[PDB]
Amino acid sequence: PSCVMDDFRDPQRWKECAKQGKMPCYFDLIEENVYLTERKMQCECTPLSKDERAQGEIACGEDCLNRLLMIECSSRCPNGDYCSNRRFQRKQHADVEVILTEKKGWGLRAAKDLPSNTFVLEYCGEVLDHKEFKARVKEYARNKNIHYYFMALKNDEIIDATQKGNCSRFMNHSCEPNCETQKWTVNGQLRVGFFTTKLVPSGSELTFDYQFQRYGKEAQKCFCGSANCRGYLGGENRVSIRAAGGK
């Protein structure tokens, strides 16, 4: 069983497919991070001419000062509509599908060949402080959740995609991954996206290295199948809730 990302846009249909086991369980699909508690300029690229745009030139490509510092351009970019450095904002995701794996739950796979360093998806969710994180830690332990969706954003910001998020919440762990997180600044605000680290052939599952900080007493066995698999999500050591949440 597999599904395409447009299938998640219809809640009534999704929920009906979920009862037939053809789609993952329902969650609230959101377009950007939602803060439970709200918290407290231009590159120097020379504008492409109309002809350069027609010739296939890239606006705000590898040499863009914002891109080099992992900062996205705004609407006021000198390249205007042609700016290729607004991928998070324009939702310029990779072509991926959500698939059911043998024993990791649902997962993500490339629907086309993905070049190296290709933006996959933004890891969206609810952003929590340490206080809200501890409450969610307790709720999810109480509910006996199997999957966890906490992603450290910065010291007192944890992205939680358990209840709200997008299809990035399905990316599974591998000890030999083909994606990575990148922290990108969008409107002075930090975001986390997934990017391929290599050429990912069509049909391959997309994975990244969780660097999981396990606070739970029980370690989840790792089914990544890598020759160098660490055996468990989080490795050997259990850390405290405070340490896992960014101290």
Partner: peptide, 14 residues
Amino acid sequence: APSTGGVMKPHRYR
């Protein structure tokens, strides 16, 4: 003292 939880930690792939 929960059962199986934890937090994923962004890092650049090395």
